[PDB]
Amino acid sequence: HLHTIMEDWKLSGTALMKKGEDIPFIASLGFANRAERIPNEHHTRFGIASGCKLFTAIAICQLVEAGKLSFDTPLSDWLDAPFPNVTIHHLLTHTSGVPDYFDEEITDDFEDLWKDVPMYHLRRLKDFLPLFQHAPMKFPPGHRFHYNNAGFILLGLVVESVSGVTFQEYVEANVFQRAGMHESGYFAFDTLPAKTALGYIDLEDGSWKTNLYSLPVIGGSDGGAYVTAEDMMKLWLALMRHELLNETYTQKLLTPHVHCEDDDYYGYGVWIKQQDGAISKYHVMGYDPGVCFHSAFYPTSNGIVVVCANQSSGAYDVMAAIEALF
Amino acid sequence: MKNHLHTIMEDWKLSGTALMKKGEDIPFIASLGFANRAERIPNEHHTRFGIASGCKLFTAIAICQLVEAGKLSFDTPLSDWLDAPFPNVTIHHLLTHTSGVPDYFDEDLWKDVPMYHLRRLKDFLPLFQHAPMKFPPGHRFHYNNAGFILLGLVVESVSGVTFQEYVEANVFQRAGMHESGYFAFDTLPAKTALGYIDLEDGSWKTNLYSLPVIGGSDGGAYVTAEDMMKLWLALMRHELLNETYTQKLLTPHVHCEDDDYYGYGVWIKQQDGAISKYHVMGYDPGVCFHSAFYPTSNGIVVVCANQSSGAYDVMAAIEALF
């Protein structure tokens, strides 16, 4: 029944819905590649922007569960770049106070970040450091909630520093592999593999362009990873079945540590919807030029929804239409 | 259906499209390899390829049209049209690579400068306009890319439209080239090959971050092989310039070395007191290109490729047929 939903909202991408034990409904629409008329299909990989902050949190928790790290550990312990009194837990919940290279509360001009800095030289997480490391802290570590991208870069640098491998290597091995996600990865624009959608930006002048020069050339600890809808489904499944972390650490990651506003809380790298004294969903989302993404696990029905799109907006409206079906 | 070009391309492992036309005959055309490796989209006859410096010829035709039109002289100082100063440099010096101006080249290149913000010829000036002249204009031949950027800027200044608009309208359209264009990487149309760079470790990457985002007057235009054939035909038939100006373009104004001479934006092979071919060529990351016209036989060869080398050997192999 997803097809009608996507058709009505004119969504180019792939949506998925799974109810408990049943096999998923999966539906693709629009083009992965407009020029070449390659339709979006079920196995098409999509960039997910901030959706993959969750994978960063999962990775960080695995290091804690493995006893190589703790949530109280100071950032000074593992990184040179000083951020006084900042702790892992501050970063995980967006309460660290660190300066951001892209404060989404005041700026939405992602592309303009790369006007002077070539985005194709953002290949390692350390390449982001100069973009914010010298800026003043915004507030005392722990003071308030403030969505922060640099904060998840810093976490990525911790994963690397603790593990000794690259962030991408860690996640593809300890998260994608350990959860059966064989069609997912941190792909780079200049080495895009088959069955990968291009991200389309629609412009004030009526024309389109792809997002090749609008995002960091490769995804990282704060966003930009690629998955298929069903690999995202598999990711929720593995998480909720304690296949990625043990029960204690899984539950710690899913704990509403911060209350943001109204029904919205944040855990470790995940959003939480809690209304009338019960959690209705855990969810992630992401928005980039040419990209939008919404995905959720509904504890009540053990439902899973995944909306991937290779356009700038729409996944939310399609997500609402689907969770209604529940 | 197979022809002998397929065999040549296969022998040299050339990914692209090649073309041969003998006088008035129907051309032979052949494609091999992938326009897009990951998607396994095959190169076909109507695939467009970047041709790097191959399009310096389009720049020279454009300039000649303006001169033929009476809006400009080959002896016109650059200072009559451009503000960036290059003292004593004439249009003619630029067209023959004898102007002595500084060059931007010469990517350590786009390591500092985002290649995606080179969308207008104007965006190149900062890369060379402040550097010192190399030698007195007219003094010496030295192949210069910035030189053709300046010529593009002259075309814009004289015509009042963008270089790309001018060429598409007065060159491509006037030649019947309906499938050619100055495409940008972030807006590539259908039937366009990606440029592949083959690394030592056996892998590949596309050239999306290795060239200026859009082609211009020193190189980077896209054509099909048959469009390029059509370009040579319209040129030689005096459809882009009258006979006087076609012949000025094709004149060996400079002896470079041995049998190699240069006219206006075109290479000239002259041996034993006779010219055997007018030709152009281009090499960029993930691009190579060779095309010639053979006056002695009215022969045309076009070799477009979406890989870094090999177009020369296919070309040499096809011309050994004339």
Side-chain angles (χ1 to χ4, degrees):
Chain A
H1 211 288
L2 307 169
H3 303 259
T4 307
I5 289 161
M6 286 178 69
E7 210 141 8
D8 290 321
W9 292 101
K10 316 299 174 183
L11 185 70
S12 174
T14 295
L16 171 158
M17 148 194 272
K18 157 151 175 136
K19 308 209 273 189
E21 240 38 17
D22 306 11
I23 79 150
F25 288 60
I26 312 191
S28 300
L29 191 68
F31 290 100
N33 190 313
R34 304 188 186 187
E36 304 293 322
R37 303 295 294 260
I38 304 182
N40 282 310
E41 67 139 332
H42 298 187
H43 302 94
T44 305
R45 285 102 154 218
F46 294 88
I48 73 183
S50 287
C52 64
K53 281 196 171 70
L54 176 55
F55 312 167
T56 305
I58 297 182
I60 282 291
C61 292
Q62 292 178 332
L63 299 180
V64 178
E65 167 172 340
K68 299 281 295 189
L69 172 78
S70 87
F71 300 122
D72 286 326
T73 310
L75 195 56
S76 55
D77 266 30
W78 291 94
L79 311 188
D80 291 329
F83 298 85
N85 291 114
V86 169
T87 64
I88 299 306
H89 164 96
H90 291 141
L91 302 161
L92 284 162
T93 56
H94 295 288
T95 54
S96 77
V98 298
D100 202 341
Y101 70 99
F102 188 62
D103 188 334
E104 304 192 30
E105 161 178 325
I106 59 180
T107 179
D108 66 352
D109 196 357
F110 201 71
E111 194 169 355
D112 192 59
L113 281 57
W114 321 126
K115 193 197 176 309
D116 286 326
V117 177
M119 38 60 59
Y120 51 80
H121 287 125
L122 293 162
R123 317 211 71 128
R124 305 295 323 278
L125 298 191
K126 16 93 52 54
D127 295 323
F128 292 75
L129 276 165
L131 302 181
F132 68 95
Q133 82 186 126
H134 297 304
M137 222 95 321
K138 309 294 296 179
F139 57 82
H143 190 247
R144 73 187 220 273
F145 180 92
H146 195 273
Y147 195 84
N148 190 302
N149 292 295
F152 269 67
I153 293 295
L154 295 171
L155 284 174
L157 289 173
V158 170
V159 167
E160 290 185 340
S161 191
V162 169
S163 71
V165 287
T166 61
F167 176 76
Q168 298 78 3
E169 278 170 342
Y170 186 98
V171 172
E172 303 180 324
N174 300 289
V175 176
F176 297 163
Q177 202 83 312
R178 206 170 147 178
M181 305 166 65
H182 319 281
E183 297 204 54
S184 290
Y186 294 76
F187 307 147
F189 285 128
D190 55 333
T191 59
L192 275 192
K195 290 191 260 82
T196 309
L198 280 55
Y200 295 88
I201 307 174
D202 287 293
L203 291 162
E204 188 171 76
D205 65 44
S207 67
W208 66 246
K209 73 182 185 174
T210 56
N211 60 357
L212 275 54
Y213 309 108
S214 304
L215 281 62
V217 56
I218 186 175
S221 53
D222 74 333
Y226 289 81
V227 301
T228 60
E230 187 169 12
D231 268 13
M232 189 63 201
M233 180 202 85
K234 292 185 196 320
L235 176 131
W236 282 116
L237 293 178
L239 179 62
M240 298 314 178
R241 299 190 182 134
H242 306 306
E243 284 164 5
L244 290 179
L245 299 147
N246 68 23
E247 168 186 285
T248 299
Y249 283 95
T250 302
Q251 198 156 334
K252 299 205 61 180
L253 172 156
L254 302 163
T255 292
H257 296 105
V258 184
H259 182 191
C260 319
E261 77 158 8
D262 304 317
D263 282 352
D264 301 311
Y265 299 72
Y266 205 74
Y268 283 164
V270 64
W271 290 100
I272 302 170
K273 191 76 55 161
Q274 187 190 266
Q275 46 212 199
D276 302 305
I279 290 166
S280 47
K281 72 165 159 181
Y282 305 100
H283 69 290
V284 292
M285 70 218 57
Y287 288 77
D288 271 333
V291 171
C292 65
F293 175 72
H294 274 99
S295 199
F297 179 87
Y298 307 85
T300 280
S301 32
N302 267 207
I304 295 172
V305 179
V306 182
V307 186
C308 294
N310 70 319
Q311 65 182 77
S312 291
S313 53
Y316 171 75
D317 305 292
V318 167
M319 155 121 137
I322 296 181
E323 59 178 26
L325 267 41
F326 279 90
Chain B
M1 171 164 168
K2 196 139 147 12
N3 63 50
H4 193 28
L5 295 192
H6 301 274
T7 303
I8 298 176
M9 289 178 83
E10 214 161 38
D11 282 349
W12 290 96
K13 300 319 184 207
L14 191 88
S15 178
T17 300
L19 179 152
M20 179 184 202
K21 181 174 184 153
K22 292 179 155 180
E24 217 70 32
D25 288 3
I26 298 164
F28 294 88
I29 311 178
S31 302
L32 184 76
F34 298 116
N36 181 324
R37 302 197 180 167
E39 306 289 0
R40 319 237 313 163
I41 300 171
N43 280 317
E44 69 165 334
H45 302 172
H46 284 68
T47 295
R48 288 84 146 253
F49 296 85
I51 69 172
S53 282
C55 59
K56 285 198 167 57
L57 176 56
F58 311 162
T59 302
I61 289 175
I63 285 281
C64 291
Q65 284 172 346
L66 299 177
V67 180
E68 171 174 330
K71 318 278 221 152
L72 181 69
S73 299
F74 293 122
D75 296 344
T76 294
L78 190 49
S79 45
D80 281 4
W81 297 98
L82 298 194
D83 282 280
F86 305 96
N88 303 116
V89 172
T90 263
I91 297 305
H92 173 93
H93 300 142
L94 297 172
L95 286 163
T96 64
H97 295 292
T98 56
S99 78
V101 306
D103 207 345
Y104 75 101
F105 182 74
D106 227 21
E107 34 92 14
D108 270 7
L109 222 330
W110 326 118
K111 194 211 307 300
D112 273 339
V113 182
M115 36 64 54
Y116 45 85
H117 285 130
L118 300 161
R119 332 227 37 150
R120 300 302 311 289
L121 271 28
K122 140 171 56 198
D123 304 315
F124 289 82
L125 286 166
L127 307 179
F128 69 88
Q129 80 189 126
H130 296 304
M133 297 281 299
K134 312 294 286 194
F135 61 82
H139 225 251
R140 229 172 80 202
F141 179 88
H142 196 272
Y143 189 86
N144 194 292
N145 287 299
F148 272 66
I149 291 303
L150 295 167
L151 283 174
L153 291 167
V154 164
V155 168
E156 305 191 322
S157 186
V158 176
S159 74
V161 297
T162 71
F163 173 78
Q164 292 82 3
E165 285 167 354
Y166 180 103
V167 169
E168 289 170 344
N170 303 286
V171 174
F172 297 159
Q173 180 166 321
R174 278 183 62 179
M177 305 169 60
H178 313 300
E179 294 171 78
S180 295
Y182 291 81
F183 310 146
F185 293 126
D186 54 346
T187 55
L188 279 198
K191 318 272 217 332
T192 307
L194 265 32
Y196 294 90
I197 299 156
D198 284 304
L199 316 157
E200 289 143 345
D201 77 352
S203 70
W204 58 256
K205 70 183 193 158
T206 47
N207 62 359
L208 277 29
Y209 307 113
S210 306
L211 284 68
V213 67
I214 184 167
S217 57
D218 69 349
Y222 289 77
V223 310
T224 62
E226 183 176 1
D227 266 14
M228 184 66 204
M229 180 197 72
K230 285 179 174 198
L231 176 90
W232 280 120
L233 294 174
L235 182 58
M236 295 311 180
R237 284 160 176 180
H238 309 309
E239 290 168 358
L240 302 173
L241 299 165
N242 63 23
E243 165 195 291
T244 306
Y245 289 96
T246 303
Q247 205 138 296
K248 298 208 84 161
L249 179 148
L250 302 168
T251 293
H253 296 105
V254 211
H255 180 196
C256 315
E257 191 188 10
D258 296 333
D259 288 343
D260 298 314
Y261 299 68
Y262 207 75
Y264 287 164
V266 64
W267 294 92
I268 301 178
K269 194 73 78 167
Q270 178 170 244
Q271 46 226 188
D272 295 325
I275 300 165
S276 57
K277 75 170 171 181
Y278 306 95
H279 72 293
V280 294
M281 41 155 103
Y283 284 80
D284 267 337
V287 174
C288 62
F289 171 79
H290 272 94
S291 199
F293 181 93
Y294 304 85
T296 214
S297 60
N298 275 354
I300 289 168
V301 180
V302 183
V303 189
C304 295
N306 66 325
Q307 67 186 60
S308 293
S309 59
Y312 173 94
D313 303 301
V314 168
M315 155 111 139
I318 299 169
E319 72 178 20
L321 297 179
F322 282 107

